[PDB]
Amino acid sequence: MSIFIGQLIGFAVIAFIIVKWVVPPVRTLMRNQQEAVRAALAESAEAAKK
Amino acid sequence: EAMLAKTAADNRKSAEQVAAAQADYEKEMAEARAQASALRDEARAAGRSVVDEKRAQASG
């Protein structure tokens, strides 16, 4: 139980670190890829229109 | 990947093909103009021949 509390606190610290300093850049990368592919699709559509 | 390559080719081909259509329009215009000029030239040459012939006959 005591070690369970210790490891739970450790996991809370790990999750805080991840959300603070790891989630933001990864979310940015995912949004960047999604925007890039969306722009590629839209540019293909306008090329077909042209 | 095929979509992106085809889109780049689409932009290139559309631009060059618009230019080609305009050039073909101008080519047809030039050909028709040359045909018209040739008709007028040969018509006036035939007229000149007719006038020369009939003047020569009148003189004779």
Side-chain angles (χ1 to χ4, degrees):
Chain A
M1 277 300 138
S2 56
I3 74 188
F4 162 72
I5 290 149
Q7 59 93 62
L8 195 144
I9 294 159
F11 173 78
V13 164
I14 296 160
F16 165 83
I17 287 168
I18 287 280
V19 301
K20 180 100 166 179
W21 294 319
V22 176
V23 164
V26 162
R27 264 187 199 180
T28 289
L29 283 159
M30 292 180 183
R31 275 90 170 95
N32 279 13
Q33 277 200 48
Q34 288 198 336
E35 291 303 332
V37 60
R38 188 270 299 164
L41 264 290
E43 190 276 331
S44 87
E46 67 84 9
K49 175 262 281 184
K50 166 163 201 319
Chain B
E1 190 276 331
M3 182 278 288
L4 188 151
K6 181 266 290 180
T7 288
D10 174 351
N11 260 336
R12 176 185 83 250
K13 181 266 289 181
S14 291
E16 65 84 21
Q17 188 274 331
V18 160
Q22 188 274 331
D24 196 293
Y25 176 84
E26 294 294 328
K27 181 174 72 68
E28 287 300 319
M29 185 64 72
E31 179 50 57
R33 193 195 295 121
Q35 188 65 243
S37 182
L39 277 296
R40 277 204 282 271
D41 291 331
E42 61 86 20
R44 67 164 51 89
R48 300 270 146 80
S49 174
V50 174
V51 60
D52 291 331
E53 190 277 331
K54 184 182 46 193
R55 188 218 296 287
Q57 188 274 331
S59 69

XYZ file of all heavy atoms in Angstrom:
825
model
N 0.849 -1.224 0.000
C 0.000 0.000 0.000
C 0.868 1.251 0.000
O 0.672 2.151 -0.814
C -0.931 0.006 1.213
C -2.207 -0.800 1.024
S -3.232 -0.216 -0.341
C -3.720 -1.771 -1.085
N 1.829 1.308 0.921
C 2.736 2.449 0.962
C 3.500 2.582 -0.348
O 3.585 3.672 -0.927
C 3.701 2.301 2.138
O 4.404 1.074 2.061
N 4.054 1.474 -0.843
C 4.744 1.521 -2.125
C 3.753 1.791 -3.246
O 4.104 2.408 -4.257
C 5.539 0.226 -2.363
C 4.610 -0.935 -2.714
C 6.367 -0.116 -1.136
C 5.323 -2.268 -2.766
N 2.507 1.340 -3.097
C 1.490 1.687 -4.081
C 1.266 3.191 -4.125
O 1.145 3.778 -5.204
C 0.179 0.973 -3.772
C -1.003 1.590 -4.450
C -1.178 1.458 -5.814
C -1.932 2.313 -3.727
C -2.261 2.026 -6.444
C -3.019 2.885 -4.353
C -3.183 2.741 -5.713
N 1.209 3.835 -2.959
C 1.071 5.287 -2.926
C 2.284 5.945 -3.567
O 2.157 6.916 -4.325
C 0.868 5.769 -1.479
C -0.509 5.345 -0.967
C 1.022 7.277 -1.399
C -0.546 5.083 0.521
N 3.480 5.437 -3.268
C 4.678 6.019 -3.848
C 4.681 5.944 -5.362
O 4.968 6.929 -6.048
N 4.347 4.774 -5.907
C 4.343 4.629 -7.357
C 3.196 5.403 -7.994
O 3.335 5.886 -9.119
C 4.284 3.152 -7.751
C 3.084 2.401 -7.229
C 1.932 2.392 -8.207
O 2.049 1.873 -9.316
N 0.807 2.967 -7.801
N 2.067 5.549 -7.298
C 0.995 6.381 -7.832
C 1.422 7.841 -7.909
O 1.140 8.526 -8.898
C -0.260 6.230 -6.975
C -1.548 6.759 -7.602
C -2.723 5.884 -7.212
C -1.792 8.198 -7.189
N 2.111 8.335 -6.879
C 2.625 9.701 -6.925
C 3.638 9.843 -8.053
O 3.647 10.845 -8.782
C 3.232 10.092 -5.565
C 2.144 10.145 -4.493
C 3.923 11.438 -5.661
C 2.673 10.028 -3.087
N 4.517 8.852 -8.206
C 5.470 8.891 -9.303
C 4.792 8.942 -10.658
O 5.209 9.687 -11.548
N 3.736 8.146 -10.836
C 3.006 8.172 -12.096
C 2.326 9.516 -12.308
O 2.244 10.003 -13.440
C 1.974 7.051 -12.141
C 1.070 7.127 -13.331
C 1.509 6.713 -14.575
C -0.209 7.635 -13.214
C 0.685 6.790 -15.673
C -1.038 7.714 -14.310
C -0.590 7.291 -15.541
N 1.811 10.121 -11.238
C 1.235 11.454 -11.368
C 2.283 12.445 -11.850
O 2.012 13.278 -12.725
C 0.642 11.904 -10.035
N 3.494 12.361 -11.300
C 4.572 13.242 -11.740
C 4.895 12.995 -13.209
O 5.102 13.938 -13.985
C 5.813 13.052 -10.849
C 7.044 13.645 -11.513
C 5.584 13.681 -9.487
N 4.958 11.725 -13.611
C 5.271 11.401 -15.001
C 4.212 11.977 -15.930
O 4.523 12.560 -16.976
C 5.395 9.879 -15.184
C 6.573 9.332 -14.383
C 5.560 9.535 -16.653
C 6.481 7.847 -14.133
N 2.941 11.803 -15.570
C 1.858 12.314 -16.401
C 1.910 13.832 -16.486
O 1.677 14.410 -17.555
C 0.510 11.855 -15.849
N 2.202 14.497 -15.367
C 2.345 15.945 -15.405
C 3.454 16.353 -16.362
O 3.282 17.276 -17.165
C 2.626 16.493 -14.009
C 3.139 17.902 -14.014
C 2.264 18.968 -14.104
C 4.496 18.160 -13.944
C 2.731 20.265 -14.114
C 4.968 19.455 -13.955
C 4.085 20.508 -14.039
N 4.600 15.674 -16.294
C 5.706 16.009 -17.186
C 5.280 15.829 -18.636
O 5.544 16.682 -19.493
C 6.943 15.153 -16.860
C 7.589 15.630 -15.558
C 7.941 15.211 -18.009
C 8.638 14.685 -15.016
N 4.610 14.717 -18.929
C 4.209 14.429 -20.303
C 3.273 15.513 -20.820
O 3.482 16.074 -21.903
C 3.559 13.037 -20.391
C 4.622 11.947 -20.257
C 2.798 12.886 -21.698
C 5.392 11.684 -21.528
N 2.230 15.832 -20.053
C 1.249 16.803 -20.528
C 1.874 18.186 -20.638
O 1.530 18.965 -21.534
C 0.006 16.815 -19.620
C -0.639 15.442 -19.585
C 0.363 17.284 -18.222
N 2.791 18.526 -19.730
C 3.384 19.857 -19.751
C 4.334 20.027 -20.931
O 4.266 21.029 -21.652
C 4.115 20.117 -18.433
C 4.783 21.486 -18.326
C 3.943 22.468 -17.526
C 4.751 23.697 -17.142
N 3.940 24.688 -16.388
N 5.223 19.056 -21.155
C 6.356 19.258 -22.045
C 6.423 18.305 -23.229
O 7.277 18.503 -24.100
C 7.670 19.142 -21.259
C 7.862 20.228 -20.248
C 7.567 21.552 -20.400
C 8.396 20.086 -18.928
N 7.883 22.241 -19.257
C 8.394 21.363 -18.337
C 8.875 19.002 -18.189
C 8.851 21.586 -17.043
C 9.330 19.225 -16.904
C 9.314 20.506 -16.343
N 5.566 17.285 -23.299
C 5.595 16.316 -24.384
C 4.330 16.371 -25.230
O 4.400 16.303 -26.461
C 5.822 14.888 -23.849
C 5.743 13.880 -24.983
C 7.162 14.799 -23.148
N 3.163 16.485 -24.595
C 1.915 16.554 -25.356
C 1.890 17.754 -26.288
O 1.417 17.616 -27.423
C 0.712 16.507 -24.404
C -0.545 16.970 -25.117
C 0.527 15.103 -23.865
N 2.327 18.945 -25.891
C 2.211 20.109 -26.779
C 2.939 19.898 -28.097
O 2.339 20.087 -29.165
C 2.835 21.250 -25.962
C 2.702 20.826 -24.551
C 2.750 19.328 -24.532
N 4.232 19.546 -28.083
C 4.924 19.364 -29.372
C 4.338 18.254 -30.228
O 4.281 18.388 -31.457
C 6.370 19.063 -28.956
C 6.284 18.584 -27.570
C 5.145 19.322 -26.950
N 3.897 17.154 -29.619
C 3.326 16.062 -30.399
C 2.002 16.487 -31.020
O 1.714 16.175 -32.184
C 3.169 14.810 -29.521
C 2.205 13.829 -30.159
C 4.520 14.161 -29.288
N 1.169 17.191 -30.254
C -0.062 17.735 -30.811
C 0.244 18.689 -31.954
O -0.449 18.688 -32.978
C -0.862 18.454 -29.725
C -1.945 17.610 -29.080
C -2.798 18.441 -28.133
N -3.539 17.611 -27.190
C -4.354 18.080 -26.254
N -4.566 19.377 -26.108
N -4.972 17.225 -25.445
N 1.274 19.519 -31.794
C 1.648 20.433 -32.865
C 2.049 19.666 -34.114
O 1.670 20.040 -35.226
C 2.786 21.344 -32.410
O 2.292 22.288 -31.451
C 3.376 22.093 -33.593
N 2.821 18.590 -33.952
C 3.223 17.796 -35.109
C 2.017 17.165 -35.795
O 1.928 17.155 -37.029
C 4.219 16.719 -34.685
C 5.643 17.215 -34.438
C 6.405 16.245 -33.552
C 6.364 17.416 -35.757
N 1.082 16.623 -35.012
C -0.107 16.026 -35.612
C -0.932 17.068 -36.357
O -1.382 16.821 -37.482
C -0.957 15.337 -34.547
C -0.309 14.112 -33.937
S -1.351 13.343 -32.687
C -0.282 12.024 -32.119
N -1.146 18.237 -35.749
C -1.883 19.288 -36.443
C -1.144 19.740 -37.694
O -1.769 20.039 -38.714
C -2.138 20.479 -35.516
C -3.378 20.342 -34.638
C -3.080 19.692 -33.305
N -4.215 19.774 -32.394
C -5.129 18.824 -32.233
N -5.085 17.695 -32.922
N -6.112 19.013 -31.357
N 0.185 19.802 -37.638
C 0.954 20.196 -38.810
C 0.752 19.209 -39.949
O 0.521 19.605 -41.095
C 2.434 20.303 -38.452
C 2.775 21.615 -37.791
O 1.891 22.360 -37.371
N 4.066 21.909 -37.694
N 0.835 17.911 -39.651
C 0.639 16.915 -40.698
C -0.782 16.966 -41.243
O -0.995 16.871 -42.459
C 0.959 15.519 -40.168
C 2.437 15.179 -40.195
C 2.694 13.688 -40.142
O 2.088 12.916 -40.883
N 3.597 13.273 -39.260
N -1.772 17.118 -40.359
C -3.157 17.181 -40.812
C -3.390 18.397 -41.696
O -4.045 18.299 -42.739
C -4.098 17.207 -39.611
C -4.185 15.889 -38.876
C -5.406 15.799 -37.995
O -5.958 16.814 -37.575
N -5.837 14.577 -37.708
N -2.854 19.552 -41.303
C -2.998 20.748 -42.122
C -2.277 20.591 -43.452
O -2.788 21.019 -44.490
C -2.470 21.968 -41.368
C -3.312 22.371 -40.166
C -4.754 22.656 -40.531
O -5.007 23.059 -41.684
O -5.634 22.475 -39.664
N -1.091 19.983 -43.448
C -0.355 19.803 -44.692
C -1.130 18.921 -45.660
O -1.258 19.243 -46.846
C 1.021 19.206 -44.404
N -1.671 17.806 -45.169
C -2.412 16.913 -46.054
C -3.717 17.561 -46.502
O -4.140 17.398 -47.651
C -2.653 15.553 -45.376
C -3.457 15.716 -44.110
C -3.355 14.604 -46.335
N -4.378 18.306 -45.612
C -5.600 19.000 -46.004
C -5.316 20.031 -47.087
O -6.080 20.162 -48.051
C -6.233 19.663 -44.781
C -7.613 20.260 -45.023
C -7.542 21.711 -45.469
N -6.916 22.565 -44.468
C -6.453 23.784 -44.707
N -6.527 24.328 -45.912
N -5.901 24.475 -43.715
N -4.224 20.782 -46.938
C -3.846 21.754 -47.953
C -3.497 21.067 -49.261
O -3.822 21.572 -50.337
C -2.671 22.595 -47.459
N -2.822 19.918 -49.193
C -2.530 19.173 -50.412
C -3.814 18.745 -51.109
O -3.928 18.847 -52.336
C -1.663 17.957 -50.089
N -4.794 18.270 -50.342
C -6.072 17.876 -50.928
C -6.769 19.069 -51.576
O -7.274 18.977 -52.702
C -6.966 17.254 -49.855
C -6.964 15.728 -49.740
C -7.653 15.098 -50.938
C -5.551 15.188 -49.587
N -6.806 20.202 -50.873
C -7.469 21.384 -51.416
C -6.757 21.886 -52.665
O -7.400 22.332 -53.624
C -7.529 22.481 -50.355
N -5.426 21.833 -52.668
C -4.666 22.286 -53.823
C -4.861 21.343 -55.004
O -4.906 21.784 -56.156
C -3.192 22.421 -53.441
C -2.328 23.104 -54.486
C -1.852 22.159 -55.563
O -1.701 20.958 -55.263
O -1.635 22.613 -56.706
N -5.013 20.045 -54.740
C -5.385 19.123 -55.808
C -6.761 19.459 -56.364
O -6.973 19.434 -57.583
C -5.362 17.689 -55.289
O -6.602 17.348 -54.697
N -7.714 19.766 -55.484
C -9.058 20.103 -55.941
C -9.039 21.345 -56.823
O -9.661 21.376 -57.892
C -9.981 20.309 -54.741
N -8.321 22.384 -56.392
C -8.266 23.601 -57.195
C -7.483 23.381 -58.482
O -7.790 24.007 -59.501
C -7.671 24.756 -56.388
C -6.213 24.591 -56.025
C -5.263 25.041 -57.121
O -5.728 25.644 -58.111
O -4.046 24.788 -56.994
N -6.481 22.500 -58.469
C -5.790 22.168 -59.708
C -6.728 21.482 -60.690
O -6.696 21.763 -61.891
C -4.581 21.282 -59.415
N -7.571 20.574 -60.198
C -8.551 19.934 -61.071
C -9.551 20.952 -61.608
O -9.951 20.889 -62.779
C -9.274 18.817 -60.320
N -9.970 21.895 -60.762
C -10.859 22.955 -61.228
C -10.197 23.782 -62.323
O -10.831 24.117 -63.332
C -11.262 23.850 -60.057
C -12.087 25.061 -60.459
C -11.226 26.308 -60.593
C -10.919 26.926 -59.240
N -10.159 28.200 -59.372
N -8.924 24.127 -62.136
C -8.198 24.876 -63.156
C -8.076 24.069 -64.439
O -8.150 24.625 -65.539
C -6.816 25.266 -62.635
C -5.865 25.738 -63.719
C -4.682 26.494 -63.138
C -4.028 27.379 -64.184
N -3.926 26.709 -65.511
N 0.626 10.045 -52.959
C 1.784 10.420 -53.763
C 1.388 10.618 -55.222
O 1.787 11.600 -55.864
C 2.870 9.352 -53.629
C 4.212 9.734 -54.229
C 4.288 9.474 -55.719
O 3.596 8.554 -56.201
O 5.043 10.189 -56.410
N 0.591 9.693 -55.760
C 0.109 9.838 -57.127
C -0.755 11.080 -57.265
O -0.686 11.780 -58.277
C -0.672 8.594 -57.545
N -1.573 11.370 -56.255
C -2.412 12.560 -56.282
C -1.573 13.828 -56.334
O -1.860 14.736 -57.118
C -3.325 12.555 -55.057
C -4.300 13.705 -54.974
S -3.534 15.186 -54.299
C -3.360 14.720 -52.581
N -0.529 13.908 -55.511
C 0.309 15.102 -55.511
C 1.056 15.251 -56.831
O 1.127 16.355 -57.394
C 1.284 15.048 -54.337
C 2.098 16.313 -54.075
C 2.438 16.413 -52.599
C 3.366 16.338 -54.916
N 1.619 14.155 -57.345
C 2.319 14.231 -58.623
C 1.364 14.619 -59.744
O 1.695 15.457 -60.593
C 2.991 12.895 -58.932
N 0.172 14.023 -59.754
C -0.828 14.348 -60.759
C -1.284 15.788 -60.640
O -1.592 16.413 -61.650
C -2.018 13.398 -60.630
C -3.130 13.630 -61.646
C -4.224 14.552 -61.114
C -5.057 13.885 -60.028
N -6.127 14.789 -59.526
N -1.330 16.336 -59.427
C -1.727 17.730 -59.273
C -0.652 18.674 -59.791
O -0.961 19.688 -60.429
C -2.032 18.027 -57.810
O -3.264 17.399 -57.439
C -2.143 19.516 -57.600
N 0.618 18.377 -59.512
C 1.686 19.192 -60.082
C 1.642 19.138 -61.605
O 1.719 20.173 -62.286
C 3.043 18.721 -59.562
N 1.502 17.928 -62.155
C 1.362 17.782 -63.597
C 0.123 18.500 -64.105
O 0.133 19.037 -65.213
C 1.306 16.302 -63.973
N -0.947 18.519 -63.313
C -2.169 19.204 -63.710
C -1.929 20.698 -63.834
O -2.324 21.317 -64.823
C -3.271 18.908 -62.689
C -4.548 19.692 -62.942
O -4.554 20.604 -63.793
O -5.559 19.388 -62.277
N -1.286 21.298 -62.836
C -0.992 22.724 -62.918
C -0.132 23.025 -64.140
O -0.451 23.916 -64.944
C -0.297 23.191 -61.639
C -1.244 23.887 -60.678
O -2.280 24.415 -61.080
N -0.890 23.889 -59.399
N 0.956 22.268 -64.312
C 1.848 22.513 -65.442
C 1.108 22.363 -66.767
O 1.182 23.240 -67.641
C 3.038 21.554 -65.381
C 3.987 21.658 -66.567
C 5.073 20.600 -66.509
N 4.625 19.322 -67.055
C 4.406 18.221 -66.345
N 4.575 18.193 -65.032
N 4.007 17.117 -66.971
N 0.395 21.247 -66.934
C -0.267 20.962 -68.196
C -1.376 21.963 -68.464
O -1.579 22.368 -69.608
C -0.818 19.536 -68.189
C -1.509 19.138 -69.486
C -3.009 19.370 -69.473
C -3.726 18.399 -68.558
N -5.190 18.641 -68.578
N -2.110 22.375 -67.430
C -3.170 23.354 -67.626
C -2.603 24.686 -68.090
O -3.140 25.307 -69.012
C -3.965 23.527 -66.334
O -4.715 22.362 -66.041
N -1.506 25.138 -67.479
C -0.909 26.395 -67.921
C -0.435 26.293 -69.367
O -0.801 27.119 -70.223
C 0.249 26.776 -66.999
N 0.371 25.270 -69.667
C 0.906 25.145 -71.018
C -0.205 24.932 -72.034
O -0.093 25.378 -73.175
C 1.915 23.999 -71.089
C 1.317 22.629 -70.841
C 0.695 22.012 -72.083
O 1.052 22.427 -73.204
O -0.160 21.115 -71.936
N -1.292 24.277 -71.632
C -2.380 23.970 -72.546
C -3.272 25.179 -72.787
O -3.798 25.339 -73.890
C -3.176 22.792 -71.982
C -4.226 22.218 -72.898
C -5.540 22.945 -72.803
O -5.889 23.497 -71.759
N -6.298 22.924 -73.885
N -3.439 26.046 -71.787
C -4.069 27.340 -72.030
C -3.251 28.129 -73.043
O -3.788 28.697 -74.008
C -4.222 28.114 -70.708
C -4.393 29.606 -70.970
C -5.388 27.566 -69.906
N -1.932 28.170 -72.842
C -1.080 28.868 -73.799
C -1.209 28.255 -75.188
O -1.276 28.974 -76.192
C 0.373 28.837 -73.329
N -1.248 26.925 -75.262
C -1.354 26.243 -76.547
C -2.682 26.544 -77.226
O -2.734 26.703 -78.447
C -1.185 24.737 -76.356
N -3.772 26.597 -76.460
C -5.066 26.931 -77.042
C -5.061 28.346 -77.605
O -5.579 28.590 -78.701
C -6.167 26.773 -75.997
N -4.480 29.294 -76.867
C -4.380 30.655 -77.386
C -3.548 30.694 -78.664
O -3.921 31.352 -79.648
C -3.782 31.569 -76.317
C -3.800 33.046 -76.662
C -2.600 33.469 -77.484
O -1.520 32.888 -77.375
N -2.778 34.496 -78.305
N -2.420 29.982 -78.673
C -1.575 29.948 -79.861
C -2.300 29.308 -81.035
O -2.132 29.732 -82.181
C -0.278 29.199 -79.560
N -3.101 28.274 -80.773
C -3.868 27.634 -81.836
C -4.934 28.572 -82.384
O -5.190 28.593 -83.593
C -4.501 26.345 -81.319
C -4.985 25.445 -82.436
O -5.944 25.831 -83.136
O -4.406 24.352 -82.616
N -5.579 29.344 -81.510
C -6.501 30.372 -81.981
C -5.798 31.333 -82.925
O -6.302 31.641 -84.012
C -7.090 31.138 -80.797
C -7.985 32.283 -81.212
C -9.320 32.069 -81.523
C -7.489 33.575 -81.309
C -10.139 33.110 -81.907
C -8.301 34.624 -81.693
C -9.626 34.386 -81.990
O -10.440 35.426 -82.372
N -4.627 31.824 -82.518
C -3.904 32.765 -83.367
C -3.474 32.107 -84.673
O -3.481 32.746 -85.730
C -2.696 33.323 -82.618
C -3.076 34.181 -81.425
C -3.778 35.462 -81.826
O -3.473 35.994 -82.914
O -4.639 35.934 -81.055
N -3.096 30.831 -84.617
C -2.712 30.113 -85.827
C -3.881 29.999 -86.795
O -3.719 30.201 -88.004
C -2.189 28.726 -85.459
C -1.726 27.902 -86.646
C -1.086 26.597 -86.203
C -2.117 25.618 -85.658
N -3.034 25.120 -86.717
N -5.065 29.661 -86.284
C -6.241 29.585 -87.143
C -6.569 30.948 -87.731
O -6.924 31.059 -88.912
C -7.433 29.040 -86.358
C -7.348 27.555 -86.058
C -7.277 26.713 -87.314
O -8.000 27.030 -88.281
O -6.494 25.743 -87.338
N -6.455 32.001 -86.922
C -6.701 33.346 -87.426
C -5.741 33.678 -88.559
O -6.146 34.206 -89.601
C -6.557 34.358 -86.289
C -6.910 35.782 -86.671
S -8.643 35.953 -87.131
C -9.419 35.794 -85.525
N -4.457 33.367 -88.374
C -3.465 33.665 -89.400
C -3.724 32.863 -90.666
O -3.590 33.383 -91.777
C -2.060 33.384 -88.869
N -4.086 31.588 -90.520
C -4.365 30.772 -91.695
C -5.559 31.315 -92.468
O -5.522 31.411 -93.702
C -4.612 29.323 -91.275
C -4.939 28.390 -92.428
C -3.957 28.508 -93.576
O -2.746 28.311 -93.345
O -4.395 28.800 -94.708
N -6.630 31.680 -91.760
C -7.802 32.229 -92.434
C -7.476 33.554 -93.107
O -7.925 33.820 -94.230
C -8.946 32.402 -91.435
N -6.696 34.401 -92.436
C -6.297 35.666 -93.039
C -5.482 35.435 -94.303
O -5.666 36.134 -95.304
C -5.498 36.489 -92.031
C -5.286 37.931 -92.435
C -4.206 38.581 -91.597
N -4.601 38.685 -90.197
C -3.941 38.154 -89.175
N -2.825 37.463 -89.350
N -4.415 38.317 -87.943
N -4.550 34.480 -94.265
C -3.740 34.200 -95.443
C -4.603 33.681 -96.581
O -4.395 34.040 -97.744
C -2.639 33.200 -95.098
N -5.583 32.835 -96.262
C -6.507 32.370 -97.288
C -7.263 33.537 -97.912
O -7.396 33.619 -99.139
C -7.478 31.359 -96.682
C -8.378 30.664 -97.686
C -7.608 29.785 -98.650
O -7.600 30.028 -99.857
N -6.950 28.759 -98.122
N -7.762 34.455 -97.082
C -8.491 35.604 -97.608
C -7.601 36.458 -98.499
O -8.013 36.890 -99.585
C -9.047 36.438 -96.456
N -6.372 36.717 -98.052
C -5.453 37.520 -98.845
C -5.142 36.841 -100.168
O -5.043 37.504 -101.204
C -4.169 37.780 -98.058
O -3.287 38.608 -98.793
N -4.974 35.519 -100.157
C -4.704 34.806 -101.400
C -5.888 34.888 -102.353
O -5.706 35.086 -103.561
C -4.351 33.350 -101.103
N -7.111 34.734 -101.836
C -8.284 34.894 -102.690
C -8.311 36.276 -103.323
O -8.516 36.414 -104.533
C -9.576 34.647 -101.907
C -10.075 33.212 -101.714
C -10.430 32.595 -103.062
C -9.089 32.336 -100.975
N -8.108 37.318 -102.518
C -8.149 38.667 -103.071
C -7.043 38.874 -104.100
O -7.271 39.479 -105.155
C -8.048 39.698 -101.951
C -9.377 39.993 -101.283
C -9.376 41.357 -100.628
N -8.670 41.359 -99.353
C -9.229 41.087 -98.182
N -10.512 40.782 -98.080
N -8.482 41.128 -97.083
N -5.840 38.374 -103.815
C -4.725 38.556 -104.736
C -5.004 37.885 -106.072
O -4.822 38.491 -107.134
C -3.439 38.004 -104.120
C -2.956 38.824 -102.943
O -3.222 40.042 -102.916
O -2.305 38.250 -102.045
N -5.446 36.627 -106.043
C -5.703 35.936 -107.300
C -6.882 36.560 -108.035
O -6.883 36.624 -109.269
C -5.939 34.444 -107.057
C -7.132 34.120 -106.181
C -8.431 34.045 -106.960
O -8.383 33.874 -108.196
O -9.505 34.158 -106.332
N -7.890 37.039 -107.302
C -9.018 37.692 -107.954
C -8.571 38.951 -108.684
O -8.956 39.188 -109.835
C -10.098 38.022 -106.925
N -7.746 39.773 -108.033
C -7.285 40.987 -108.695
C -6.341 40.667 -109.846
O -6.342 41.375 -110.858
C -6.623 41.932 -107.688
C -5.321 41.444 -107.091
C -4.563 42.585 -106.426
N -5.396 43.337 -105.495
C -5.543 43.047 -104.209
N -4.931 42.013 -103.656
N -6.329 43.812 -103.457
N -5.543 39.605 -109.728
C -4.703 39.200 -110.851
C -5.553 38.778 -112.043
O -5.257 39.138 -113.189
C -3.774 38.065 -110.429
N -6.614 38.009 -111.792
C -7.508 37.613 -112.872
C -8.176 38.828 -113.497
O -8.329 38.902 -114.721
C -8.558 36.634 -112.351
N -8.588 39.788 -112.671
C -9.151 41.014 -113.214
C -8.167 41.761 -114.093
O -8.525 42.245 -115.171
N -6.916 41.874 -113.642
C -5.898 42.538 -114.449
C -5.708 41.816 -115.775
O -5.569 42.451 -116.829
C -4.580 42.604 -113.683
C -4.660 43.361 -112.370
C -4.370 44.839 -112.548
N -5.156 45.654 -111.629
C -4.855 45.846 -110.352
N -3.779 45.304 -109.806
N -5.654 46.602 -109.605
N -5.701 40.485 -115.743
C -5.590 39.726 -116.983
C -6.765 40.017 -117.907
O -6.583 40.191 -119.117
C -5.508 38.232 -116.678
O -5.549 37.469 -117.871
N -7.978 40.072 -117.355
C -9.160 40.317 -118.181
C -9.082 41.693 -118.826
O -9.372 41.859 -120.019
C -10.444 40.166 -117.346
C -11.654 40.562 -118.169
C -10.593 38.735 -116.861
N -8.706 42.704 -118.044
C -8.638 44.054 -118.593
C -7.561 44.138 -119.665
O -7.768 44.750 -120.717
C -8.417 45.096 -117.481
C -7.138 44.836 -116.735
C -8.398 46.494 -118.072
N -6.401 43.520 -119.429
C -5.357 43.539 -120.449
C -5.828 42.849 -121.722
O -5.621 43.362 -122.829
C -4.088 42.877 -119.914
C -3.423 43.694 -118.825
O -3.559 44.935 -118.846
O -2.761 43.096 -117.951
N -6.482 41.694 -121.585
C -6.970 40.973 -122.755
C -7.953 41.823 -123.548
O -7.843 41.946 -124.775
C -7.628 39.663 -122.314
C -7.973 38.705 -123.450
C -9.301 39.022 -124.120
O -10.200 39.572 -123.450
O -9.444 38.720 -125.323
N -8.926 42.423 -122.861
C -9.977 43.127 -123.583
C -9.450 44.432 -124.170
O -9.868 44.837 -125.260
C -11.181 43.343 -122.666
C -12.392 43.990 -123.359
C -13.591 44.248 -122.421
C -13.233 44.892 -121.085
N -14.374 44.822 -120.116
N -8.512 45.093 -123.484
C -7.865 46.263 -124.070
C -7.082 45.890 -125.321
O -7.127 46.609 -126.326
C -6.941 46.934 -123.052
C -6.390 48.279 -123.529
C -4.942 48.507 -123.112
N -4.783 48.579 -121.665
C -5.166 49.608 -120.922
N -5.715 50.685 -121.460
N -4.986 49.559 -119.605
N -6.344 44.777 -125.281
C -5.606 44.355 -126.465
C -6.554 44.064 -127.619
O -6.288 44.440 -128.767
C -4.759 43.125 -126.148
N -7.670 43.394 -127.331
C -8.635 43.094 -128.382
C -9.231 44.372 -128.962
O -9.401 44.493 -130.184
C -9.732 42.184 -127.830
C -10.682 41.651 -128.883
C -11.819 42.602 -129.184
O -12.246 43.371 -128.324
N -12.314 42.558 -130.414
N -9.567 45.333 -128.098
C -10.109 46.598 -128.581
C -9.094 47.328 -129.450
O -9.449 47.890 -130.489
C -10.539 47.473 -127.403
N -7.824 47.323 -129.046
C -6.797 47.961 -129.864
C -6.670 47.274 -131.218
O -6.530 47.939 -132.251
C -5.459 47.947 -129.129
O -4.944 46.632 -129.028
N -6.717 45.940 -131.235
C -6.594 45.230 -132.498
C -7.739 45.530 -133.444
O -7.526 45.792 -134.633
